[PDB]
Amino acid sequence: VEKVFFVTSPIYYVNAAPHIGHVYSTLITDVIGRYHRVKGERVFALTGTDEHGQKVAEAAKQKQVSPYDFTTAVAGEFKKCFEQMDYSIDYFIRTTNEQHKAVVKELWTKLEQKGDIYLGRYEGWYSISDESFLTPQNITDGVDKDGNPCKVSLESGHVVTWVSEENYMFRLSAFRERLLEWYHANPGCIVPEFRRREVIRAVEKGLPDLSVSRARATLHNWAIPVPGNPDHCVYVWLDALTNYLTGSRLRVDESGKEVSLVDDFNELERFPADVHVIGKDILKFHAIYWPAFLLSAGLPLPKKIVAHGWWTKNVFDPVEKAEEFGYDALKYFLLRESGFSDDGDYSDKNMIARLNGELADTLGNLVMRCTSAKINVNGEWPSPAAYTEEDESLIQLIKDLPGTADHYYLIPDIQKAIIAVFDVLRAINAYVTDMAPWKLVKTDPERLRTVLYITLEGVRVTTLLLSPILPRKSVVIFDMLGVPEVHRKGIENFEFGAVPPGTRLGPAVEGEVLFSKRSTE
């Protein structure tokens, strides 16, 4: 089916300021989005804030301001951060939004009508900071900010409290079999695989019913009322997970403000998400609860959930570090340095290593070589002569790259996609050192044409597939290479030889550097 490619970040709690956790999650969302736009598809990327809850109100209480003021402000801080980071997210959703609340009421009522919601009790442990229900096996001893003998979550380490409330309960136990079918039938639906195996083991152990309402007093009334029972409020997580459904039904205008909420999700061709980007901290909510709610309501399940190494909830300010090293450079580092186990190194020493070693020396260097007036004497893409077997060996790599990178982007594994491109860049540099085109201006012009054309085309294709990672620098590179706008996106232009010979380069700046190297501290 030809739909809108729907990619989402998680919606972040507004109890605190934007930090790297959120910037990272939304960066992954943004890159996936951009890739599918470069591929020439329709894209809706969603991000936003998660504004109801005991945890938010109790943080608004701390600053001694009303919940409406505190959330609006922090939401603003989030919006500004994402504009500074230079994402291309299509909409910013807020759970305080009135359209969103309508959708939550719709969904709640649908679940009630199915007989999947009932009035019961929850008597157990709860982490206010995680907004998570925990069994006694998931808790152990620890300390509070006041350093007293309290209990804490094994998951997160935040403080837990015992809760004994009469709650509206969701019949999650009844969705154990159908969830297991979904996992085993769609083995790519949770990524990476070891997290898929985690979710499956957990559901096989057994599922308790899930409390989906709280008594309004406990939430400091900062929540959505349960339809037809204002004594209770809706669990922040059913509220929160529903943002994806809300998002898929909002018409948005030129400026990014929402204007209309359609009745039927099919009208906009967005639901369900093709990728949900999340941190490992919130895997169970997205891989167990969410599909069960959607199963209950007769809605379609998402295609992929990708859970990364960081935690979604010693200073490291992204906006500071981007101002010091470059914006695209930082994004490159975060996407290249870590896969899906979180153990990677985020020191300056390392970023500089990757900035100099890879962005400057591999990519940047190569861009300057194939454009410089010394080597490229006519300032154009020359017409190639006949190809050696060494020429063919490089061309073959260039031709294979798009398919390879495409499979990686689709997993999705953005680290592996980058690596695949840089493998081809390293190869092109090797070909250039070997060919030595700087010598060939004097001795052999017929040959230089061939060498230079291949270089240029390798640089174009590598740059095209890197454009979701380095969106600004890719534009600068293409300008230098003189690539017409039409050839900068679309699967058509993944093919070798898309730009014809005789294409003129962009004008040069006598002092232009693509990536400037920085000192080993």
Q: Does 239 contact ligand MET by CB under 6 A?
A: no
Residue with smaller CB distance to ligand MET, 282 or 448: 282
Alpha-helical runs (H) found in 362-413: 365-371, 389-410
Please identify which residue in 38, 93, 240, 454 interacts with ligand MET, judged by CB under 6 A: 240
Scanning 6-14, 58-66, 266-274, 297-305 for contacts with ligand MET by CB under 6 A, the matching segment is: 6-14
Residue 47 found at the interface with ligand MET (CB under 6 A): no
Nearer to ligand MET, 169 or 240 (CB): 240
- Phi first, then psi, for residue 384 (nearest 5°) are -75, 150
Q: From the CB of 51, what's the least distance to ligand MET, in Å? A: 9
Considering beta carbons, is residue 214 or 473 the nearer one to ligand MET?
214
Burial class (CB in 10 A: 0-12, 13-18, 19+), 137: exposed
- Shortest Å distance, C-beta 56 to ligand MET: 9
Which residue number, 123 or 342, has a Cβ lying nearer to ligand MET?
342
Convert residues 285-314 into a mask of x (bound to ligand MET by CB under 6 A) and - (unbound): ---------------------------xx-
Q: Which of 75, 189, 190, 282 binds ligand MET (CB under 6 A)?
A: 282
Q: How many CA atoms lie within 13 A of 447 on its CB side?
A: 15
Of 6, 12, 24, 122, the residue at the interface with ligand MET (CB under 6 A) is 12
Look-up: residue for tokens 């649908």? 110
Nearer to ligand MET, 294 or 514 (CB): 294
Taking CB under 6 A as the criterion, the residue among 27, 28, 45, 50 binding ligand MET is 50
Which of residues 47 and 376 has its CB atom nearest to ligand MET in the complex?
Answer: 47
Rounded CA-CA distance 477/125 in Å is 55
Nearer to ligand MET, 53 or 458 (CB): 53
Task: Compute, in degrees rounded to 10, the torsion defined by CA atoms 266, 267, 269, 273.
Answer: -60
280 belongs to the binding site for ligand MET (CB under 6 A): no
Q: What is the C-alpha to C-alpha distance for residues 308 and 411, in angstroms, rounded to an integer?
A: 13
Member of 6, 7, 10, 402 binding ligand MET (CB under 6 A): 10
* Structure tokens given for 454: 């291949």
> How remote is the C-alpha of 504 from its chain's centroid?
36
Cβ 189 to ligand MET shortest distance, Å: 17
Q: Judged by CB under 6 A, does residue 29 bind ligand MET? A: no
The DSSP secondary-structure symbol of 171 reads -
223 sits near ligand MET (criterion: CB under 6 A): no
CA distances from 293 to 272, 314, 467 (A): 13, 39, 37
Name the CA radius of gyration of the chain, rounded: 26
CA neighbours closer than 13 Å in the CB half-sphere of residue 377? 10
Listing DSSP states for 195-243 in one string gives HHHHHHHHHHH----EE-EEETTTTTT-SPEETTEEEEEE-HHHHHHTH
Nearest-approach distance from CB 208 to ligand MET, in angstroms: 20
Using the rule CB under 6 A, is 96 a contact of ligand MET? no
3-state SS class at 190: strand
Number of chain positions touching ligand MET (CB under 6 A):
10
Query: Contact at 8 Å (CB) between 394 and 312?
Result: no
Please answer whether residues 299 and 270 qualify as being in contact, where contact means their C-beta atoms are separated by less than 8 angstroms: no
Q: CB-wise, 213 or 312, nearer to ligand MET?
A: 312
CB of 91 to ligand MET, least distance (A): 15
**CB 48 to ligand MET: min, Å:** 9
Alpha carbons 35 and 43: distance in angstroms, whole number: 10
What's the CA gap between 280 and 337, in Å, rounded?
18
Give SS3 for 365. Answer: helix
Q: What is the closest distance, in whole angstroms, from the C-beta atom of residue 219 to ligand MET in the complex?
A: 15
Contact set with ligand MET (CB under 6 A): 10-13, 50, 240-241, 282, 312-313
